[PDB]
Symmetry: C3
Subunit: 334 residues, 3 copies
């Protein structure tokens, strides 16, 4: 007999986040979301390597869901008949039934509706988990995203001061396991089922072939670079459902970071690089001080430069010579 107001959310594809309030005068609501599973072959690199992806809402990562502490999150999970496998959903933000996984197993052609109370604040992973060896395989195939549960008074610095972001981006990092043939080329497969045996053999060796942001090498570069202006406070939510990551903003800092991702704890200040434990999401806020190109990377630089894990920010504004200056340009040695 839960008679609270209902609110529908129109999810948007990462790295963007659906519109939301930080601090709110709204009381608890039932917030309604819909996720539709899509299994699909996608291209993950600039060489044309293909991958058997499985996704929530067609994206890797799945979209970021944003609610406030004490809301009830009501998700309709849909598994169309065009898919081949059973799927479910496990929210790390939720309490009971394996995070919802034990209540959401659906075959192709079915849907289910789960409600959970958002009793814990922070950013949290959600992922598919349809039992046994299928659990890692569905997650590393792309079936993961995140939810953010905000305090109703918004974020704070642990010393009584509000922290308000001007914009938020969600960076979902994906470790992928694409097998190679005898001569050393990546293999292509006709279905997720056909990719399973070779993929699992590689998975158990624990070394990914690719580590990407937003589903593909270079996804968050060029036309699709992240953007900001000097003076803007940007929140970057970072998740990794299976493997550790160490985010770093090249040329910047984490001014306020929740590396374990949970807003009941004060943020740490002034970090160079932070650590996202596999199976979690974290968040870092930075106020841009300088214009120009920044790279956002995992600071295993082999992964960042060679395996795919680099995003860019393009930042507009005025250069600050007090903070940094080229005193003397490259010249011949005296």
């Amino acid at each position: 007999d839960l008679k609270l107001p209902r609110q529908k959310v129109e999810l948007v594809a990462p790295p963007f986040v659906h519109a939301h309030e930080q601090a709110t005068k709204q009381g608890p609501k039932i917030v309604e979301f819909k996720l539709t599973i899509e299994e699909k072959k996608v291209v993950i690199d600039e060489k044309g390597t293909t991958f058997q992806a499985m996704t929530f809402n067609g994206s890797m990562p799945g979209p970021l869901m944003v609610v406030h502490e004490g809301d009830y999150v009501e998700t309709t999970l849909v598994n169309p008949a065009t898919n081949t496998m059973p799927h479910n959903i496990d929210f790390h933000s939720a309490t009971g039934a394996l995070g919802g996984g034990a209540l959401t197993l659906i075959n192709p052609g079915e849907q289910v509706v789960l409600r959970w109370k958002a009793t814990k604040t922070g950013v949290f992973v959600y992922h598919c988990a349809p039992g046994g060896p299928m659990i890692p395989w569905h997650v590393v195939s792309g079936m993961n995203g995140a939810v953010m549960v905000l305090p109703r008074d918004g974020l704070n610095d642990g010393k009584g001061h509000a922290l308000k972001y001007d914009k938020v981006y969600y960076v979902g990092e994906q470790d992928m396991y694409v097998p190679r043939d005898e001569k050393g080329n990546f293999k292509s497969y006709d279905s997720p089922g056909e990719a399973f045996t070779d993929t699992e053999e590689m998975m158990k060796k624990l070394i990914p072939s690719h580590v990407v942001f937003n589903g593909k090498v270079g996804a968050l570069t060029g036309k699709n670079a992240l953007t900001a202006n000097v003076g803007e406070n940007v929140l970057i939510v970072h998740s990794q459902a299976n493997r550790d990551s160490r985010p770093h903003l090249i040329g910047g800092h984490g001014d306020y970071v929740w590396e374990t991702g949970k807003f009941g704890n004060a943020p740490e200040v002034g970090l160079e690089t932070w650590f996202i434990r596999g199976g979690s999401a974290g968040a870092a806020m930075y106020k841009f001080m300088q214009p120009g190109i920044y790279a956002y990377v995992t600071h295993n630089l082999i992964e960042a430069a060679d395996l795919g894990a680099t995003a860019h920010f393009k930042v507009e504004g005025k250069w600050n010579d007090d903070l940094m200056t080229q005193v003397k340009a490259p010249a011949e040695i005296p």
Copy 2:
């Protein structure tokens, strides 16, 4: 001339913990423990793979030792003549002599008695360390456990409030390196000595064949699942003497977590997944809110599902529909 009262402890096999007080009105005591080394071939998986184990007290992990700050811990380490190698013990809780290792090297047929003052609170690893390349080999063969040093006033939340657990479990995670033959089957050996060359070659490649809790795949499942009731506050001590781990309670949380494991620091609150640095123990407390099956995993899901690192909790009590409910069971899509 140390004339304090003596107290003997009867150690018990993991995941259980010998009986102890949290807050105590006892003053410092000399607490007496005995560990007897056993080298033994064991089965580590449901396929019948064997492993040359080396253990404290016949178990992997070694038993949890519990004392209070300011106690003196007096350990009799015994290396029976039925063993083949020298062994020792290094306590991360202890100060000096390589943690005791430099004072406890014993050949088969010898015993030694070490006393150390428990000046640092928290959970800490202990492990064998008999010099050079033998150090990693004895540890990854199973020669590690943990000790817990409690404040005399018990645990607190860093904000002045007591945190009392209703029960404690010790989960020791073991990375194992079992070599394979040409056709790809795991190899069996007649002695630890015979397993050494092949095992060391694999170890140096840094990828385990198995990652297990309590010594074997499935050790903490079925009849041997962990248990709780709705409303019980459970402390889970987690150690990993060689390699990082990222614990996660599927369907729950870490309500209070000391991921670096040291009680001089306030716990973090409301975590989804925490991080145990290789060479350390950590502790997490959770009050169960929902009945049913939970899985406790490292959230590298490949390790958890495919390499062995999953435990279960079976929890009794009343389902809470406010926290989670299946609004609509699986049905055909409209």
Copy 3:
């Protein structure tokens, strides 16, 4: 028009650190440093394995630079014509232009002068980053070091009390990727360019052949052991520009640790093992209580004992039997 006093620093090779004040009554200064790049073939192990190194100032790690909050750091980077490749420098302590990398790219025969304002306190990595796949390759070839930015009032414990160290050491950990030939011996190369193809293939597999402190197996052992006396408070700065590490002082503790390395955050107390995220530096302070040999390791014990990552401390002073004692020496079992 920046008219502050100038101060030159004479850098010294790691693990030592150039002389500096902790708390200072000096105001902001322009502190002047010079780094000269050297590409050179070096021996990294006791078997005589060679490696194509690239370094700042001829050392791995590069020297520790020490300044105070609000200083301006003016670095002359020199790339002599005896080198073969372009190089640059990226300071994680700096704000803008990819940490300075976008302003410091120099060919063999050129130098550049960069100034940045030290607005963030802590220890921070610096490394070369000359674009694309070259970034990881130059870093894992040895082109990284660290800078320490002290509060002007020196270090504190977060509870109002000064923490003053008696001496500081800088331990730079390097993951190295040396390829093997068919029969399994490590390969030697005539130039960094010639080592590139084989080295990159190995790098992308993410498993190092060697993990060393101060450039070589055994660098910080024997005549070159670290030293202290009972009663001395020693700060150990640890960096790792590419890969995670888990420092541990065998027989000691981290009395005060900033594992994310940033002095705006209070240190954690009483750690056994701490965690240095790849792409960062951290710092730990310990007051020695016992004489004798200590080992300082990463507590992946395979890396420590088998791949090269062990340093020693030799500590003078009086043994404390209250803290630890051998109650009974090794004797035959009754």
